[PDB]
Amino acid sequence: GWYN
Amino acid sequence: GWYN
Amino acid sequence: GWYN
Amino acid sequence: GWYN
Amino acid sequence: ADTIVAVELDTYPNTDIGDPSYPHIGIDIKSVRSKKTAKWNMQNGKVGTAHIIYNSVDKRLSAVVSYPNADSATVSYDVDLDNVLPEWVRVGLSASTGLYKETNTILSWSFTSKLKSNSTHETNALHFMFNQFSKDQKDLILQGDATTGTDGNLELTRVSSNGSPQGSSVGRALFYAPVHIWESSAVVASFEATFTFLIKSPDSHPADGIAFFISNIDSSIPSGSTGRLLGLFPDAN
Amino acid sequence: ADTIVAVELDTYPNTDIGDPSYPHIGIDIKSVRSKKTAKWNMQNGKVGTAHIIYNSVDKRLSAVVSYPNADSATVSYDVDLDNVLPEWVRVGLSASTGLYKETNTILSWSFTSKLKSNSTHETNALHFMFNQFSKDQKDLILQGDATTGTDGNLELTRVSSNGSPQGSSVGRALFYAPVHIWESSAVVASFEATFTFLIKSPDSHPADGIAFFISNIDSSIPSGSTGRLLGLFPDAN
Amino acid sequence: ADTIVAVELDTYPNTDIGDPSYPHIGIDIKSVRSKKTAKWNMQNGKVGTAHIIYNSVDKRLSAVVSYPNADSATVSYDVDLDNVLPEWVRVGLSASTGLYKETNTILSWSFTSKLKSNSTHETNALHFMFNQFSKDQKDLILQGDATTGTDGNLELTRVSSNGSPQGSSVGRALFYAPVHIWESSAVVASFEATFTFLIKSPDSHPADGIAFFISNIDSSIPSGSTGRLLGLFPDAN
Amino acid sequence: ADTIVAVELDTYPNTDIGDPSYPHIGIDIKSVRSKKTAKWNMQNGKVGTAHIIYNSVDKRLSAVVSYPNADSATVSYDVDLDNVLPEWVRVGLSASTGLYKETNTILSWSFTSKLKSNSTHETNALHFMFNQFSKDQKDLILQGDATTGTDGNLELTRVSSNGSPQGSSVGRALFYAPVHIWESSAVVASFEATFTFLIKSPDSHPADGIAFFISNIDSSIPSGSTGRLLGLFPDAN
Ligand SMILES: *OCCO[C@H]1O[C@H](CO)[C@@H](O)[C@H](O)[C@@H]1O
Ligand SMILES: *OCCO[C@H]1O[C@H](CO)[C@@H](O)[C@H](O)[C@@H]1O
Ligand SMILES: *OCCO[C@H]1O[C@H](CO)[C@@H](O)[C@H](O)[C@@H]1O
Ligand SMILES: *OCCO[C@H]1O[C@H](CO)[C@@H](O)[C@H](O)[C@@H]1O
Ligand SMILES: [Ca+2]
Ligand SMILES: [Ca+2]
Ligand SMILES: [Ca+2]
Ligand SMILES: [Ca+2]
Ligand SMILES: [Mn+2]
Ligand SMILES: [Mn+2]
Ligand SMILES: [Mn+2]
Ligand SMILES: [Mn+2]
């Protein structure tokens, strides 16, 4: 999810 | 002289 | 039996 | 003077 | 479930479960939701050092994570471990990767625990130091993906033959002997742990982190605990 | 004046200079008027143990004083020793008597300090352990009335040939080597001291106490510092 | 069969298998018939101390057994443990009685082992110290009649309710963690062990002794190894 | 004159005083003419390690000097230090250069001594560890040309601005605290010292070497002890  |  |  |  | 006390070096922000939005170090008491966190300027590809300390006088669990010639990150949490952990525990290192990955390479790890009894004032002590790991390190309990011996290092999660980190990995290494971490009849109990680590993500998208942890002696990687659960917790509660 | 950080085991209440009205343990930072004290149920003629700990993570000086099978006394004070002490110090034990007296007998004394570079993450360490003292203990600097060798003990203050303690006495023992107690370049700095002591007052009128202290390397017993000043301070400020 | 290297404190002369006609200490290499012995003036009912040392530089196993205020007994034997033991071992204490008996009480036990790699010149180390033993001590593997708890001691062999040592008893305590006792890639390898013991025989007819031993990791008491076999060997060969 | 026991890493063959015709390690007992030597394959400009051990059981002084991935050189000598050294000593490192020169850089130095009394069976201990050296390091007595503070190293002999070692230099570093190296009423006494060193000779003509030494507490560099005398001996007797 994050990085994304 | 605490114990006097 | 050494003591015996 | 070992190494010279 | 297991009882976990851990210091996490969390490289990946899982905000949906309480992580702050940056890599951080944390004190985890029986939950992946750290009781306390500190911002951590993790340096991809560089060898770092974690020092963890606790004593029963201050009952303060503290940790400092640093890289050479950089400011350190520090986190501390007041906790009475007598009230959390069983008397006898195992200590270990854990790490995980998920969708994102990183090497979780441990280059060295030492630990000392001391317990001086109240009725006798004499000391019990355990200390181990590994500055190198061998291919068959019999005083380590390796769990999950953890392997030893490659370059003399402990790899907590899967790496390729060339050192490429793999996603969805989890692995732990526990010291073989149980540790008497507290005893009510002790004047002072204390422990310290230090480890050096190399987290590399050529991807530059690192996850998930490394933890030093203290657990019930029969602790194992909880089912499914890759990724954000760091190999420590059964769920995100 | 010298710079002193000390843990005092104060057997004699000098209420006119801030002592509480009972034997107490205290943390002294550059003053005999402790920054923090705890009630201490001294046991005349019984061997007790003092444990002192400090680390630069928590920056908290703590001490625990106990007798076997009794509740311990504990005292802690947050202090940044970086800002109080010189980088290099000597460590020692001090004791005094005044109008009233007590044996200030040390049966054992150990100390460990560790200092870990931030530029290198390598550790310097000093440890010494005395579980007996010889008549010519050359790694101790004895000051004032301190002697070694009788019963293998260190007598900080004067005692007669039968062990009768004398009034108006003051004596110190400093470990010979300076200690690198803090360094700004260090990731973590820590030390611990333990000593066991036998304070005995035949008349049950003990004074004045024993202190573990950390000082500038060239520290000496201040002039006049018998009695309530514990051989540590030049005045009661 | 197990592979055993041991230092025996042998209180009972078994002359038919090569014991000298006096209590003695001995170095046992894979046989109860010691490769080297020395007379030992065992003192019934007095706490003694045994110290065992080995290093891979000299490859010499030595032991000294002493009582306070008495001349010590010392024995040494050149042995290359690389050629005798497996790389990983467990270390332990063992004791036995037979027709005659004695208490085989261990009051304290400490061990340190260190391995310095040839490749890296960094050291792996293990240290433990027990100055008291607890009921249910999880870092000890107790075998046979060995128990902990009473007096904070380790009783290797059976003692009755009234404190009478029982005959034909055998018991051992092994430290839980395997020890990396030698390695070809090591520059220096070394270990030391120290234990204090109380051997007491009411009838002044003591048997059979105490040993510190090093063994294959999975070592167990050889069946029938009471009496002269010291809990170490399956026979007297 | 001083009383010196030393382990020399002698890089320069002085065949007239008994040196073999190659760099060698040696055990020096009150003389520069080693009682025992071993061929040493000195590696110019590489970091080496030296480990020195002695215990009063074997009464064998042994040393091993090695470089990573190279075979070690080992030398050993039976000697009763009770009959050579004073009870109290200082320990140090010394180095010299002569017509030929080399850097004599020490990167780390650790020492541990332990002394267990026969009367009490309790142990006194000293341990220090320098993994870096600071400017004005107050727990070292620097003598002659020895300096600390560049690169966190100890330079025993003079190095000029351009990094070139200077000839006819001699310098030593002694640990500040005296060491109780033997005692008649000790059960077992032991010490060990380890140091890492970097000897570089840019013209591949190195001299003269580095020694670990133990001396009378007030030992100073003998005047004129550059060159083959290693900063240790006043003459070549
Ligand atoms: O989009 C977020 C992906 O979540 C997975 O990957 C992360 C990072 O590896 C991990 O924390 C999480 O548990 C999931 O595996
Ligand atoms: O009655 C007052 C006595 O004071 C002297 O004795 C006490 C106890 O030893 C001591 O603290 C004080 O400094 C004086 O010496
Ligand atoms: O009288 C014969 C003794 O032999 C037995 O008892 C001794 C002493 O305990 C023991 O060494 C031997 O193995 C036998 O058990
Ligand atoms: O050519 C002889 C040189 O002797 C001097 O230099 C050597 C090597 O430095 C040294 O051992 C000797 O004592 C003299 O100083
Ligand atoms: Ca996370
Ligand atoms: Ca007072
Ligand atoms: Ca026998
Ligand atoms: Ca020479
Ligand atoms: Mn987190
Ligand atoms: Mn006070
Ligand atoms: Mn025998
Ligand atoms: Mn020579």
Side-chain angles (χ1 to χ4, degrees):
Chain A
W2 164 288
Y3 293 138
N4 304 350
Chain B
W2 174 255
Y3 308 101
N4 16 135
Chain C
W2 169 270
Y3 303 104
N4 351 292
Chain D
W2 183 258
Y3 305 101
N4 279 261
Chain E
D2 290 335
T3 296
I4 299 289
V5 167
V7 169
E8 56 166 61
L9 282 55
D10 191 341
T11 60
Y12 188 92
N14 304 270
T15 51
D16 48 338
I17 63 153
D19 278 351
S21 307
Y22 38 75
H24 55 284
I25 52 181
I27 299 310
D28 297 349
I29 308 299
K30 295 166 69 175
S31 161
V32 80
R33 298 176 185 255
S34 309
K35 298 318 180 187
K36 197 108 298 132
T37 64
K39 189 151 178 301
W40 172 35
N41 301 309
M42 189 281 265
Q43 304 194 36
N44 197 319
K46 189 181 290 289
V47 178
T49 295
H51 295 106
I52 297 102
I53 53 179
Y54 174 85
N55 70 76
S56 68
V57 181
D58 296 324
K59 304 190 204 299
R60 194 154 129 115
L61 178 64
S62 297
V64 177
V65 181
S66 60
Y67 292 102
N69 301 276
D71 292 319
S72 78
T74 303
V75 67
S76 308
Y77 182 65
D78 271 22
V79 54
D80 194 344
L81 293 181
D82 298 10
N83 305 20
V84 183
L85 294 158
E87 182 143 349
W88 286 92
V89 297
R90 269 198 168 111
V91 300
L93 300 173
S94 186
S96 67
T97 60
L99 179 72
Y100 298 110
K101 37 189 151 56
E102 76 197 18
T103 64
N104 293 123
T105 304
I106 303 297
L107 311 214
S108 69
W109 174 32
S110 65
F111 176 80
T112 296
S113 65
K114 283 191 289 278
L115 198 71
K116 348 223 179 186
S117 249
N118 183 96
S119 72
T120 130
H121 287 20
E122 307 218 44
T123 330
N124 285 19
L126 169 72
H127 170 73
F128 60 80
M129 169 168 294
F130 319 99
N131 280 304
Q132 148 203 22
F133 301 87
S134 59
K135 264 84 164 52
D136 193 75
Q137 190 76 46
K138 297 198 188 302
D139 53 6
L140 285 186
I141 295 155
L142 297 180
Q143 302 180 327
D145 293 336
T147 60
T148 50
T150 51
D151 309 16
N153 292 328
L154 159 64
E155 297 285 6
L156 289 170
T157 49
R158 294 290 172 201
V159 300
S160 73
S161 79
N162 77 332
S164 312
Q166 302 289 333
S168 302
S169 183
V170 58
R172 311 199 316 183
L174 293 79
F175 187 67
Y176 204 95
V179 181
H180 206 168
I181 209 67
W182 67 262
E183 184 174 11
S184 344
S185 101
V187 186
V188 290
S190 68
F191 69 81
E192 70 188 33
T194 305
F195 65 92
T196 58
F197 57 91
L198 181 44
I199 295 163
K200 302 192 255 82
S201 197
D203 208 67
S204 212
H205 302 68
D208 273 273
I210 297 169
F212 164 80
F213 75 94
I214 299 192
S215 69
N216 42 302
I217 55 177
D218 55 336
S219 175
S220 302
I221 296 181
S223 177
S225 65
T226 56
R228 65 189 187 180
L229 300 191
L230 294 168
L232 301 175
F233 303 103
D235 55 48
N237 285 3
Chain F
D2 287 339
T3 298
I4 299 279
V5 171
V7 174
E8 55 169 62
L9 279 52
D10 191 338
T11 57
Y12 186 90
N14 299 274
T15 58
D16 56 323
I17 64 151
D19 278 352
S21 307
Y22 41 80
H24 51 280
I25 59 175
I27 301 306
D28 297 353
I29 307 297
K30 293 165 69 174
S31 167
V32 76
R33 298 177 192 246
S34 311
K35 303 307 188 175
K36 191 81 159 294
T37 61
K39 190 164 202 296
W40 173 36
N41 306 291
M42 200 268 310
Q43 298 194 44
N44 186 18
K46 294 306 187 258
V47 175
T49 299
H51 297 285
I52 298 106
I53 58 170
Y54 177 86
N55 73 78
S56 63
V57 181
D58 307 316
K59 292 176 170 308
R60 186 164 195 172
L61 179 62
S62 294
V64 180
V65 181
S66 71
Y67 297 97
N69 303 305
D71 291 343
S72 71
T74 305
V75 65
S76 314
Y77 185 70
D78 285 347
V79 56
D80 188 350
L81 292 179
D82 292 18
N83 295 323
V84 181
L85 290 164
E87 270 192 49
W88 288 92
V89 299
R90 272 195 170 105
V91 301
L93 297 173
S94 186
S96 70
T97 60
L99 172 64
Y100 296 106
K101 60 263 184 163
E102 75 200 19
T103 61
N104 292 121
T105 308
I106 304 297
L107 319 202
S108 67
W109 178 27
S110 69
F111 174 87
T112 298
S113 173
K114 295 177 291 274
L115 201 62
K116 319 189 156 237
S117 154
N118 183 38
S119 71
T120 321
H121 291 15
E122 285 163 5
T123 299
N124 286 15
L126 168 73
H127 164 74
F128 60 79
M129 168 167 298
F130 301 111
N131 279 316
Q132 63 240 307
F133 300 87
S134 42
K135 301 271 295 137
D136 195 5
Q137 193 75 51
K138 295 188 187 302
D139 48 7
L140 288 181
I141 296 169
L142 301 184
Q143 295 177 334
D145 292 334
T147 61
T148 49
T150 182
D151 311 338
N153 297 322
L154 159 61
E155 296 285 10
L156 289 171
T157 50
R158 208 61 81 178
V159 296
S160 73
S161 49
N162 55 18
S164 303
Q166 304 301 306
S168 303
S169 188
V170 54
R172 309 198 317 183
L174 291 76
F175 184 68
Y176 207 94
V179 185
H180 203 172
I181 212 69
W182 66 264
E183 181 164 55
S184 41
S185 123
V187 184
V188 189
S190 67
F191 68 82
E192 75 181 49
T194 301
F195 65 91
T196 64
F197 58 88
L198 181 44
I199 289 162
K200 203 188 327 173
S201 180
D203 48 10
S204 315
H205 289 351
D208 272 88
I210 297 173
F212 168 80
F213 72 97
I214 304 172
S215 70
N216 40 297
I217 61 178
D218 55 331
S219 174
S220 298
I221 295 173
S223 174
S225 61
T226 52
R228 63 189 186 183
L229 300 181
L230 297 175
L232 290 180
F233 302 102
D235 55 49
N237 295 346
Chain G
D2 289 345
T3 300
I4 296 282
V5 167
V7 173
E8 56 169 59
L9 279 54
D10 187 344
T11 58
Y12 187 88
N14 300 95
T15 53
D16 57 322
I17 62 175
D19 277 349
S21 296
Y22 40 80
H24 51 286
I25 56 178
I27 296 302
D28 295 354
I29 311 292
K30 297 167 79 165
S31 172
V32 70
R33 298 186 193 242
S34 308
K35 307 305 188 177
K36 187 71 136 309
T37 62
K39 182 161 194 296
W40 169 42
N41 304 289
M42 198 275 299
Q43 294 186 37
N44 201 336
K46 297 309 181 325
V47 180
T49 299
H51 185 47
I52 292 116
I53 55 189
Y54 176 90
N55 75 79
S56 67
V57 180
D58 305 326
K59 284 184 175 190
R60 184 176 191 80
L61 180 56
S62 298
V64 44
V65 181
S66 57
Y67 293 92
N69 309 129
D71 290 353
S72 66
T74 301
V75 69
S76 298
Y77 186 71
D78 283 1
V79 55
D80 190 344
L81 295 182
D82 301 12
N83 288 313
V84 181
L85 295 167
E87 259 185 70
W88 291 87
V89 295
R90 273 194 170 111
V91 298
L93 300 168
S94 178
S96 65
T97 56
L99 166 71
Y100 300 107
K101 58 239 193 303
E102 72 197 20
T103 61
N104 293 117
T105 312
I106 302 304
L107 309 192
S108 64
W109 177 26
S110 64
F111 178 83
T112 305
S113 184
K114 298 175 277 262
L115 267 176
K116 182 131 172 161
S117 61
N118 199 84
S119 173
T120 58
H121 291 188
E122 53 204 339
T123 292
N124 285 15
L126 170 74
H127 166 75
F128 61 82
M129 193 167 52
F130 303 122
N131 282 313
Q132 111 134 236
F133 296 90
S134 72
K135 206 60 194 57
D136 180 27
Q137 190 169 324
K138 306 222 174 66
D139 53 4
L140 282 190
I141 294 162
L142 304 186
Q143 298 184 332
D145 298 336
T147 57
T148 58
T150 78
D151 238 343
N153 293 332
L154 164 55
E155 300 284 5
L156 289 167
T157 53
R158 195 67 69 185
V159 176
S160 64
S161 296
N162 67 7
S164 304
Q166 300 306 308
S168 308
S169 181
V170 61
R172 315 196 311 185
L174 291 78
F175 187 67
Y176 205 100
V179 178
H180 203 175
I181 206 66
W182 67 261
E183 197 183 23
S184 311
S185 73
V187 184
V188 181
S190 80
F191 68 85
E192 61 178 320
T194 304
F195 63 93
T196 64
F197 59 95
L198 183 46
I199 295 177
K200 177 152 35 76
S201 185
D203 50 21
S204 306
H205 294 346
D208 273 85
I210 298 177
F212 168 80
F213 71 98
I214 308 185
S215 69
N216 48 302
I217 286 179
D218 56 332
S219 179
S220 51
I221 298 175
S223 304
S225 62
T226 56
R228 68 192 186 174
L229 298 184
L230 298 172
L232 294 173
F233 303 100
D235 57 51
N237 292 1
Chain H
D2 292 335
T3 298
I4 300 289
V5 166
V7 168
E8 55 166 62
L9 280 46
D10 185 342
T11 57
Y12 184 88
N14 302 93
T15 51
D16 42 328
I17 56 166
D19 281 350
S21 303
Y22 39 76
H24 50 283
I25 52 179
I27 301 298
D28 295 352
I29 308 295
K30 294 170 69 169
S31 173
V32 77
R33 295 172 188 255
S34 307
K35 298 312 184 187
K36 202 80 185 201
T37 64
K39 184 163 193 302
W40 167 42
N41 304 294
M42 196 273 278
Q43 290 189 43
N44 210 13
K46 304 290 172 35
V47 179
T49 300
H51 183 49
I52 290 107
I53 55 177
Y54 179 86
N55 72 75
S56 65
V57 185
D58 305 320
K59 304 233 178 186
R60 198 162 165 84
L61 181 59
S62 300
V64 50
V65 181
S66 56
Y67 293 91
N69 308 318
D71 285 339
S72 69
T74 301
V75 68
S76 298
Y77 184 57
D78 298 346
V79 55
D80 195 343
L81 297 172
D82 310 354
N83 302 325
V84 181
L85 293 164
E87 266 193 78
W88 286 94
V89 295
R90 274 198 168 109
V91 297
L93 297 173
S94 177
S96 68
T97 61
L99 161 68
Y100 299 106
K101 52 250 184 164
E102 70 196 21
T103 62
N104 291 118
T105 311
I106 303 298
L107 284 75
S108 70
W109 180 25
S110 57
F111 173 81
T112 297
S113 175
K114 298 185 197 84
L115 194 70
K116 176 150 175 304
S117 264
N118 192 78
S119 56
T120 70
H121 277 25
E122 268 205 287
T123 161
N124 289 15
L126 170 73
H127 164 75
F128 63 81
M129 168 174 291
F130 307 118
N131 278 312
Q132 78 174 19
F133 297 88
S134 62
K135 180 67 83 191
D136 197 14
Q137 176 160 339
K138 304 237 156 275
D139 53 10
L140 286 184
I141 298 159
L142 300 180
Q143 297 182 331
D145 296 340
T147 54
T148 55
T150 102
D151 238 12
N153 296 328
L154 164 57
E155 295 290 5
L156 287 170
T157 49
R158 284 286 176 228
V159 172
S160 69
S161 295
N162 70 347
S164 306
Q166 297 308 311
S168 298
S169 184
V170 58
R172 317 196 308 188
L174 291 84
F175 184 65
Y176 211 99
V179 179
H180 203 172
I181 207 74
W182 71 264
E183 189 169 32
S184 181
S185 65
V187 168
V188 34
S190 73
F191 64 87
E192 60 172 302
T194 301
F195 65 94
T196 62
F197 57 92
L198 178 42
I199 290 166
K200 188 35 168 42
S201 182
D203 52 27
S204 299
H205 291 348
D208 274 83
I210 297 170
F212 164 80
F213 72 99
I214 302 174
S215 66
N216 40 303
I217 54 178
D218 54 330
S219 171
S220 52
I221 297 172
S223 308
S225 62
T226 56
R228 65 189 184 171
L229 302 179
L230 295 175
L232 296 178
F233 302 104
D235 54 47
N237 286 0

